[PDB]
Amino acid sequence: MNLNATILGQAIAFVLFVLFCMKYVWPPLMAAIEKRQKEIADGLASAERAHK
Amino acid sequence: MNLNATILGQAIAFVLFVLFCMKYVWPPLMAAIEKRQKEIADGLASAERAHK
Amino acid sequence: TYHLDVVSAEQQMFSGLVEKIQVTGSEGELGIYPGHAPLLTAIKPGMIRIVKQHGHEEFIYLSGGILEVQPGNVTVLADTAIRGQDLDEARAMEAKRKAEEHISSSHGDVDYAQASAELAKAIAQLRVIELTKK
Amino acid sequence: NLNMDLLYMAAAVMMGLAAIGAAIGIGILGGKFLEGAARQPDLIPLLRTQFFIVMGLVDAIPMIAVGLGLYVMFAV
Amino acid sequence: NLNMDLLYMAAAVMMGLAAIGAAIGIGILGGKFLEGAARQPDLIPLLRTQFFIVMGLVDAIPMIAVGLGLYVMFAVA
Amino acid sequence: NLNMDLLYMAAAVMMGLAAIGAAIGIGILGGKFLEGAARQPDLIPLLRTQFFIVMGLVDAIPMIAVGLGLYVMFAVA
Amino acid sequence: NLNMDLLYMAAAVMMGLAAIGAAIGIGILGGKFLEGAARQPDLIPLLRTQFFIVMGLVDAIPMIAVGLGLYVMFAVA
Amino acid sequence: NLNMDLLYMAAAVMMGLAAIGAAIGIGILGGKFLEGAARQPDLIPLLRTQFFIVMGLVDAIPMIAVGLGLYVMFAVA
Amino acid sequence: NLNMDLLYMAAAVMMGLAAIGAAIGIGILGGKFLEGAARQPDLIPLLRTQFFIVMGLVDAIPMIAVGLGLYVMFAVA
Amino acid sequence: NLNMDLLYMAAAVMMGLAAIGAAIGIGILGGKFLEGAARQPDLIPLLRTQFFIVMGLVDAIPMIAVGLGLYVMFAVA
Amino acid sequence: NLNMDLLYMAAAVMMGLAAIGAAIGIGILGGKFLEGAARQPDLIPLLRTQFFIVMGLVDAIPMIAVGLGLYVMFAVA
Amino acid sequence: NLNMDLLYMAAAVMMGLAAIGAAIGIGILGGKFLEGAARQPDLIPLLRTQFFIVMGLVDAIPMIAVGLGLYVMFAVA
Amino acid sequence: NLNMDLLYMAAAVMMGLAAIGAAIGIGILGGKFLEGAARQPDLIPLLRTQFFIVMGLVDAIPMIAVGLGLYVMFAVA
Amino acid sequence: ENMTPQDYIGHHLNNLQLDLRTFSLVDPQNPPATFWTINIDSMFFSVVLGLLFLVLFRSVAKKATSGVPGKFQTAIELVIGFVNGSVKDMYHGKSKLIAPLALTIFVWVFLMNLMDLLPIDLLPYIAEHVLGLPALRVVPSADVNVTLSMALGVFILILFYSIKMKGIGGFTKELTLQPFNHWAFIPVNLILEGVSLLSKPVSLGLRLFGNMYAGELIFILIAGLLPWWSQWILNVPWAIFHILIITLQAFIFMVLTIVYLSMASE
């Protein structure tokens, strides 16, 4: 067997894995990143309204 | 598999990473989070007393 | 299609022909349809959705009841019922406000269960005004 | 010699256990389909759709075992 | 010779496991059918059709196993 | 000779597993029939019709295993 | 003539699987019979009739396995 | 050497499977008896009278397998 | 030497099979006992009586197989 | 060879079957325990005492096999 | 030759047991999915997401055996 | 030779039983997970938490078996 | 000498079976534990306590079998 | 390179070690038997990933603000909240150790598993052809010694807390009298509770290992046996599948460590 061919096949397999992660695993993360702050985001503003 | 000195060498790294995480990493992070939650707490307080 | 009746001692709440309905239950809501098995059923706080022939809908909150189903003519013998325009989102907030008061009010476990049911009722009212917007 | 009849026995073990798994997992799944059908004749096509979805998952391993059983048996 | 003995043992274990799997799989599916018919017998012709539709998939593999068990015993010998 | 030793054992595994599949399959389907009969008597003959319909399908693969175990025992060995 | 020892092993596997299949088969069928009797005790002599009719089918294949295994154990060995 | 040895192995497998069959089949039948007893305890003496009838059929086949197990160990040796 | 040394394996098979049969048949039966107990908890001593009734029957065949296994170890081998 | 290795294999069969039986029998019995404890959350101390009564019987028969297996490994082999 | 005729059986054991495990485990989970989807159809997309998630959990462990089974059969031969 | 050959079979049996045990085990909990969610959709993230708790407990022994399977096959071979 | 091959097989059988029994026993008991939450939301700290108490009993014998299997593979073999 | 499928798979399970009694690197085929022979590559990546972890977290922790956090600061406060939530739900004691312990287990095990997704030859190829090292394989959790080292750590914590929170009198009571209560059963009860207690952490370590060893092996198999034009279509589904495994194994090792210390102490 050609070991360089195994590295070729592994390269293509990594590329296609990256392409799935980018489209299905990362955006749930950037969603949750924005969401973490967003879930209690208005909370800080709500505290000042009571003083008003 | 084969027992080896790695079983001992890795235990040092683990214990030391836990001690440093306990002192340096965890208290300042939880301090910043709780300081935020507390502050969103206190605004909701003022409303009840003022209205009464 | 089939017909459903809905009543409480204080009033008839709805009656008419329905292509379909969705109804609260004990272990959560269920869909109901002409072909559904004749399931006599208990009810916890929630709503019923009333989709009449040619697909036109109404959205009723229920305090509680029982959904007998011998026939295709089915009935809900509700303990108390209010529709999603007979209540409003402010009235559902008043139900929630009463629930928050009841949570504050006492230590007793059955009182606490009554307060928790009042919360579930209040959120079911809010949900029915959301269903009414839908 | 002794080699070939033992190959036929190994193929029989793969394709037999595959028969058990593919039969019982669909018996268990189809009974729930039939009770839902008897409860919801209105959603037989919808439930049947879901039934094919999961059926494809149940069959996934047994068909590998069957394809290898045929290989061991006839191609080696 | 011994080759026959081992080929008969292979066909026997293949058909035996096929018999267990196929008969218990249909006994479960059918118990569900008979209960759904008892609850309301108006659907017997309808459910008995869905019954055959599912039972078709139950018997797919076991009849591959039987077809090859028979082949091993009568043509591999 | 060595042939009868292994050929009887092959037949024995064949009809033994067939006895498992046929007894468990009819045990489950029959228990559902008897509960249905207790639940709604006077529907016994209708349910019995359905029970014979499903029972014919349950006994299919086990009877092939029986017929071939009889063949191996009283024909091959 | 070593042949005698394997025939006892083959009869042992036939009668062992037959005792498992017919005992768990009648255990499931009878448990459904007892729930039926606990619900409708005035129906018990009717359910016993249906239970003996189905039980005659549960023991069809196992009494063949015990029949031939007892034959193998005495007549052939 | 291994002829008398294997006779003991055949008895071990015969009684082992009969012990699984009888234990499981009575476990299932007695569990449904206990659940009918819990639902209608004042009816227990009748259901108990039905349990003793069904249990005898459950145990009848597992006890002929044991009898042949003792025959293989003591008489055939 | 192998003639006695394998009798330890014969007893191993006999009583290990008995152990799985008994432990599972008692698990099923006691499960239905504990559910009956939860449904009517004033009733426990009566149902527990019926449990001790039928459990005796569950363990009889396993217990004789355990006794014979121990005999095969300490007396024969 | 044949003396020591088979004794370890016998031990392996005795305590592997005892692992199957003691683990599955308590998995089943304890699930019924947790079901009753959910229906009647005032009963948990009573039901757990009943569960210990039943669990003792479940574990007693496998413990014979486990203790004897340890005997076979240390004292015999 | 004598060496290789057993590696196809090591493969057969790994892929048979992993096919039984993965198929019945997914059968158990999927029927519960179709049941809950029958009670509240609005949830069907939600439940479908939970269904594939837990199915990803169930199938992960049995698949490994099939992977090495392909290694053994086509690389170890 | 057998010191090489048998190790592959021993690993095969280790990863076969590991695959059946792990695949069958969590399916019941996954079932109560999906039906419970369909019944009480408000509690889903809570029940999901509890699900993870019981799932991480079901994995210990099958992962012991499969990890040592890869040890037997690759390190000692 | 050949003897070492059988020791790995013996540990293989005893540990594989212990993985079967601990996986299914925790599956069943942990599904009843999850299921118990449907009716009420005031029991997870209690039930999780009881669950660990009974689960401790479920895997113990499997863990014994595995511990002896480990001793056989590494120390004895 | 002239490696056969099986031979290359071999060299992909072959390991490089350093003999502490001679400071020699270890040959592709001739290991020293002495256990003082450190698996250097897995130590190197293990400690470097743990260093990276502590540098990344300290760089935020020394600056973190309770206003609306920055994009990076948010991704750390998320995992902090996620870990705290898991601890608070399962542990009710006063001890300051348990929450950072949970954190370090989660993030370090996570980063160690993350190595498995890379192309299996990338770093080994560079380490042989650029650096000239006689072997490399990079996934740290894919070797027993680290996972048992972490498990033995947790076992020492389990012992400490069962001794501290309830003493030798209580621990000896629980270990002897349960489950059969009567003093008559103490010799048997010792067996039943002892094998359970000692197997729980050892099982936790090997529980993670039994996944990452097979994980890497599966990638090795797919890269060794199949031709390149069919390697990709069968590798990619395993990589996508193994993402869920790495995430669950990290979560599991954390959660189970909290479960064990909670059940031990309270």
TrEMBL record, chain C:
Q: Which GO terms describe its molecular function?
A: ATP binding; proton-transporting ATP synthase activity, rotational mechanism
List, for all copies, the residue spans of the domain called ATP synthase epsilon subunit C-terminal.
86-130
Q: Is the Transport keyword given for this protein?
A: yes
| A Pfam family matched in the record | ATP-synt_DE
Which residue intervals define the domain ATP synthase F1 complex delta/epsilon subunit N-terminal in the entry?
Answer: 3-81
Q: Name one GO cellular component term.
A: plasma membrane
Q: Cite the entry's keywords alphabetically.
A: ATP synthesis, Cell membrane, CF(1), Hydrogen ion transport, Ion transport, Membrane, Transport
Q: Which family does it belong to?
A: Belongs to the ATPase epsilon chain family.
Biological role stated in the UniProt entry? Produces ATP from ADP in the presence of a proton gradient across the membrane.
Q: What is this protein called?
A: ATP synthase epsilon chain
Q: Per UniProt, what is the name of the gene that codes for the protein in this document? A: atpC
Automatic annotation (TrEMBL), chain N:
Transmembrane intervals: 33-57, 97-115, 144-163, 208-230, 236-261
Q: What is its main location?
A: membrane
Give a Gene Ontology cellular component term annotated to this protein.
proton-transporting ATP synthase complex
Give the GO biological process terms.
proton motive force-driven plasma membrane ATP synthesis
| Pfam families named in the record | ATP-synt_A
Gene3D superfamilies given for it?
Answer: ATP synthase, F0 complex, subunit A
Q: Which keywords fit this entry according to its UniProt record? A: ATP synthesis, Cell membrane, CF(0), Hydrogen ion transport, Hydrolase, Ion transport, Membrane, Transmembrane, Transmembrane helix, Transport
Q: State the InterPro entries in the record.
A: ATP_syn_F0_a_bact/chloroplast, ATP_synth_F0_asu, ATP_synth_F0_asu_AS, F0_ATP_A_sf
Q: Where in the cell is it found?
A: Cell membrane; Membrane
Q: According to Swiss-Prot or TrEMBL, what is its membrane topology?
A: Multi-pass membrane protein
For this protein, what is any one GO molecular function term? proton-transporting ATP synthase activity, rotational mechanism
NAD is among the record's keywords? no
> Could you tell me the superkingdom of the organism this chain comes from?
Bacteria
Its biological function?
Key component of the proton channel; it plays a direct role in the translocation of protons across the membrane.
NCBIfam families on file: ATP_synt_6_or_A (TIGR01131), PRK05815.1-1 (NF004477)
Return the protein name: ATP synthase subunit a
